């Protein structure tokens, strides 16, 4: 960095730094913080985290793989690593449990730079729009266990259905993953990520049945796929 | 149209309703179906409607 500017830093498991400093705690003598945890948790990470940054005579760009212990995102490792990020995208079981498998929670997953005057006003309007039906479908997602799909009105019907469009079109089979898996990779534009996600929801590709979105590529895969079944 | 739920359920998806009778519920009477039939009914006098079927259960 401190020479030629533009670097790229990839770190698996911060936590396991982190976790390592645990073990050794109890031998280092000092009393122990919440959940068992070292009571310099809150600098170890800072530490390390701060060093991470753009100079002025050259940036690092970033991305590390911060585990989440038991699941439990209020555990400290995670709640803490959190503030240290720019874009935190955050994988949830329940999502994986489906089939959906960048299982990318797109709800509790955010960036700092989701901001209009950053990423243009299409981009922005149709990450939230995206963001908030798929919102207004967790709700419902209660009454629906409970009284069944009839229930809901004629409009809030609509919402499940294109939520769930929504939902498994955020899929898509990565190249490194065909390996355990038939399904041969894809690369989405960012340009078609939008043309795709602000189309479903303007009503454009309801006909078509949700497996059509289901582990695809740009949207016209999912029209073609949809011929086959 | 006859009961509130396909009043709702048309007033959404649309259609064409010439007339209605709503509030019954288990009370159902042949005094508040005149109005509705006598629309439908009229309606084939005049060649209105060429045919006239019931929706029901």
Known sequence: ?????????????????????????????????????????????????????????GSITSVQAVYVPADDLTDPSPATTFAHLDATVVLSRQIASLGIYPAVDPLDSTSR?????????????????????????????????????????????????????????????FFVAEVFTGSPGKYVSLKDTIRGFKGIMEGEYDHLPEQAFYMVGSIEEAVEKAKKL | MIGSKGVSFFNSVGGNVVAQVTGMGDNPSLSELIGPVKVMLQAYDEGRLDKLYIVSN
């Open chain 1, 1 to 57: 960095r401190d020479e030629g500017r533009d670097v790229l830093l990839f770190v698996d498991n911060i936590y396991r730094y982190t976790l390592a400093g645990t073990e050794v705690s109890a031998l280092l003598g000092r009393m122990p913080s919440a959940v068992g945890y070292q009571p310099t948790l809150a600098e170890e990470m800072g530490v390390l985290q701060e060093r991470i940054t753009s100079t002025k005579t």
């Open chain 1, 113 to 173: 730079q989701l901001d209009p005057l950053v990423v243009g006003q299409e981009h922005y309007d149709t990450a939230r729009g995206v963001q908030s039906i798929l919102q207004r479908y967790q709700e419902l997602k209660d009454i629906i266990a409970i009284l069944g799909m009839d229930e809901l009105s004629e409009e809030d019907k609509l919402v499940v259905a294109r939520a769930r469009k929504i939902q498994r079109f955020l899929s898509q089979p």
